[PDB]
Design a protein around this nucleic acid. Sequence first.
DNA 1: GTAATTAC
DNA 2: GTAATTAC
Length: 66
Amino acid sequence: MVKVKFKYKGEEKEVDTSKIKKVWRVGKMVSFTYDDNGKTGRGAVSEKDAPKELLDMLARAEREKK
DNA sequence: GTAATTAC
DNA sequence: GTAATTAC
């Protein structure tokens, strides 16, 4: 589907956007958590390194209400 | 140091 | 309590 590649704790990782639980912006950085098979993972990429799909999920996050 | 947020 | 993440 759409793989987000990132290095966390020196390790290069790849995760599908379908496993991404939460997304948020921190400056020009995009952070998120994903389903690391039960245990929750953490990751972040440069806004310039993010596939459009992830940026779309962030945009929808910023619009949420209630 | 700070920006948001969380796993640990 | 704090490390972790990119950019400034």
